[PDB]
Ligand binder design. Sequence first.
Ligand SMILES: NC(=O)c1ccc[n+]([C@@H]2O[C@H](COP(=O)([O-])OP(=O)(O)OC[C@H]3O[C@@H](n4cnc5c(N)ncnc54)[C@H](O)[C@@H]3O)[C@@H](O)[C@H]2O)c1
Ligand SMILES: NC(=O)c1ccc[n+]([C@@H]2O[C@H](COP(=O)([O-])OP(=O)(O)OC[C@H]3O[C@@H](n4cnc5c(N)ncnc54)[C@H](O)[C@@H]3O)[C@@H](O)[C@H]2O)c1
Ligand SMILES: Nc1ncnc2c1ncn2[C@@H]1O[C@H](CO)[C@@H](O)[C@H]1O
Ligand SMILES: Nc1ncnc2c1ncn2[C@@H]1O[C@H](CO)[C@@H](O)[C@H]1O
Ligand SMILES: [K+]
Ligand SMILES: [K+]
Lengths: 475, 475
Amino acid sequence: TQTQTQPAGNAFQYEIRDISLAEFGRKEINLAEHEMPGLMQTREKYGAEQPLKGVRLAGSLHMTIQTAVLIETLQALGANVRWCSCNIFSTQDHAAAAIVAAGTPVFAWKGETLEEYWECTWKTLLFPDDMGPQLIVDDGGDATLMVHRGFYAEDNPSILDDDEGSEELAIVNKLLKRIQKEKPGYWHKIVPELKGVSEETTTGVHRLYEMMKEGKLLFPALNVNDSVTKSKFDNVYGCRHSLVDAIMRATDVMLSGKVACVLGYGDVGKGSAESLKGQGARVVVTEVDPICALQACMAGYEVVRIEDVLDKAEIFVTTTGNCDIIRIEHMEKMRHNAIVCNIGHFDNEIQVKALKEFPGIKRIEIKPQVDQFVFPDGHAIVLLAEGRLVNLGCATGHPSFVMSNSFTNQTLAQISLWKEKYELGVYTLPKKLDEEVARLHLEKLGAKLTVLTDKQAKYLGIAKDGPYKPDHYRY
Amino acid sequence: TQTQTQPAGNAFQYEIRDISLAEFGRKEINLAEHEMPGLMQTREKYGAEQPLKGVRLAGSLHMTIQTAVLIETLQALGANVRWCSCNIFSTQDHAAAAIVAAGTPVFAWKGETLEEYWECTWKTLLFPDDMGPQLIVDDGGDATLMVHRGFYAEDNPSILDDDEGSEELAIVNKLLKRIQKEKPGYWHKIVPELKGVSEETTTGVHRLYEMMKEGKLLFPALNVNDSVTKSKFDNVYGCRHSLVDAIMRATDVMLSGKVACVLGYGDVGKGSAESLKGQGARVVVTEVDPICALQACMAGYEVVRIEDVLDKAEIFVTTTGNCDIIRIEHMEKMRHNAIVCNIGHFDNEIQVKALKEFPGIKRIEIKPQVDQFVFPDGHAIVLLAEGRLVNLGCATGHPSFVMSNSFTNQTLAQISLWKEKYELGVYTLPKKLDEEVARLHLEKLGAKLTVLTDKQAKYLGIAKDGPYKPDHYRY
Ligand SMILES: NC(=O)c1ccc[n+]([C@@H]2O[C@H](COP(=O)([O-])OP(=O)(O)OC[C@H]3O[C@@H](n4cnc5c(N)ncnc54)[C@H](O)[C@@H]3O)[C@@H](O)[C@H]2O)c1
Ligand SMILES: NC(=O)c1ccc[n+]([C@@H]2O[C@H](COP(=O)([O-])OP(=O)(O)OC[C@H]3O[C@@H](n4cnc5c(N)ncnc54)[C@H](O)[C@@H]3O)[C@@H](O)[C@H]2O)c1
Ligand SMILES: Nc1ncnc2c1ncn2[C@@H]1O[C@H](CO)[C@@H](O)[C@H]1O
Ligand SMILES: Nc1ncnc2c1ncn2[C@@H]1O[C@H](CO)[C@@H](O)[C@H]1O
Ligand SMILES: [K+]
Ligand SMILES: [K+]
């Protein structure tokens, strides 16, 4: 994909698809602001204080219209922002253009190659005068991964020669090796000034705990995914909206009456099942966790192993955050034109590589991000977004109103990481702030909260203004 | 209510309504055993070990057919059991009779007075030879309350002279005064031998933390309510079944098209709203917690203050565990024959006392536990179960299959309290045991659980046999 970079001598750097989309992007941002009252009210509340004044802030998170409102909230609070997407297909090019037109470095376009993706991550982290970010907003942990690998590779450069059998890790290694030649010691220079990362998603938080357990985490992390107002809203209701949206845009297939296999029944699987059930699909669920499996049964879904429904299901959606959920031997047995997609993580929930390399397979692009793979025996499957996040790759991701929850959490997390003294570890926002995120969205919905009386507050032993629930409450 | 006590010289004591109901109770217990695979498999698993051999075990928990299977599970593991109900209307007299016919002390019948209720609690706690329980199963904390008040009043008997403006506390104080006269030092004798309590319900757990906060808890407690397989199944799906069941049995009123006000949207409120929505009611929800309120909005419910639906709703259900949810000034404004009921706690969610004492009000019993209160202006309301737990008071409570979750947790909690050396505090069962509770119920449902491969287990950093989720996971 041919891109536009900043003119020579421009005040700031960028790389996007098309700056002429800016006016359209700005119109949709204006509409989205009205749909994001929590984010806009937080922008107003902290505006005078300027809590992020001058902070070098790098974000690696889907460059959508919703993220544009987050970027401009962080800027309204004083931050000096650079941004890239965290997925090669998730950028909305009009959002990127509108943000560049406002003067902000963005390195993101829809349809990046993997090489381009990591080059964009580097451009985002590299601030002028060979500086780095003082705070990072991350979704999936790729920016955090690059910082850590760059730092540890400066101590032991041989790790840049072990790709672990991963073509993508080879890309990262080659980039880091080039940076060692161009900017020796860069990562050791910038890590002491990087005061924290706020991480958006379940897989990114898992990566943070891998690092913290090995004693390798280099700076504090705020787990935004596990705010109640994120995990229980974005992951559930966001996917309820955006999964079926993407399937409809990509394929225009009727869901009603079809068997749809949802693999996983965590937060994303729960919302995904509801997304399809609302259209009259008969949803069947796979799970490894017996509690989640029992929840699916109590919702009226049949709990199956994938092999049990290869002759029945015509839609498969992976939601696990795990590897090798839909294997090549499964796809060999699927019904003709069965739709195969992933809403969980990266691209390894489906064995996309083994599918592409299957002997004698023929690939036909129906349209961008919709690929029919025809097997020699004559049956085909339809893969969406090359097995990457389908809601963002084939539609527009979650709608603004729910992203206002997630991004109010991100804003408060950035403020907290900057103002508070966190030790090395992974933290969550206090429950009273989590409650505030929800509270800010009630007025637009016409929802009126009841206020505890003095007698009731004493009876329950809680304050009228919260927090209302014990620390361990599950909602 | 005329009761039957054991014959003079009987091997054991009891007080129930009618022993002739035993054969009917036993038939329903036989059916319920098939619906409770978690309990029945737990019997087989721990049968040889006899982990509760000889343990004096007192239960204060709704004397239902489901509790009969729990009692006989505890006995099948060796326990020496005595039982009473924790609510004056919740006993199923046939269940009580079937358990007495099997040789077990039960002090419970449907329609006790408050004085009789506390006399039954005392008969349950008092073991032969002036002994007490070594373990307690409690639901709502009444037995735990009596033990603590008995112990502390032996140090300061003037505690028994302060009724605190409560007729029911006056009943407890009068009984404790008699026990001080008949058996001085009884509570100081039995407390050192009482190894723990396992508490079934949200309100009882709240009481445990209040005692912990005051430094007054006298023995360890296992919080059964907050097992995942209890709170997210019993409190939710149990009420989804048993709320509408009770409303239908009590009133035979069509829910479809009516506005039904559910006050509270925690676990019980969530299940209650689903109970009514399934019949085409238009559910409106009240809440003090903005997170729970936002969840209700995302489910398509209008969130209101009760005052905005007094001219609309014809059903009101309190689910809060809090006091003074439905006030007399609300009931004065309700639509004619509006149904008013409580599925939360005790009898103070609705201002039943103020209703009974309202000037000029007329009470007409339609049938047991269904009372029409006719106001002087001609409008009436229909109060269910005198404002006590409506599912247990006007129907049969939760169905056996979901109680198998709760009662497998109770069984495991009793085993744990007996075998492990807990300190003074409130504890929950380990996640792997919580998962086991769910796993035991999958076969009857036909659910097929997937097993992680070695590669997937390594990828996620978990064991193939669990636990599958972080400690703080909310499901
Ligand atoms: N695309 C989006 O917009 C979006 C939104 C939120 C989160 N996410 C991503 O979605 C993924 C899931 O997130 P979550 O919050 O639902 O996590 P979760 O832990 O709540 O749920 C994942 C579930 O997958 C199950 N699972 C794991 N391996 C399995 C297997 N082999 N077969 C069947 N089930 C299996 C687990 O038991 C678990 O219940 C993560 O990668 C997360 O980052 C994506
Ligand atoms: N009848 C049954 O079979 C049964 C089953 C389970 C639990 N319970 C009982 O039900 C009650 C609720 O339990 P839970 O697990 O749902 O507790 P919970 O804490 O999950 O929910 C209670 C909800 O009530 C809300 N609330 C409190 N005061 C309010 C007010 N004035 N107006 C509106 N909302 C208000 C709280 O914000 C909370 O979300 C407890 O008393 C519990 O012991 C009964
Ligand atoms: N419209 C969107 N804009 C930005 N991020 C999104 C959008 N929809 C979903 N996401 C995020 O993508 C993450 C997965 O990488 C989810 O945790 C979710 O918060
Ligand atoms: N059928 C039943 N038998 C015994 N206890 C029940 C039944 N239905 C509901 N309960 C319990 O009553 C408690 C409320 O006192 C709930 O926590 C729930 O576990
Ligand atoms: K969107
Ligand atoms: K029942």
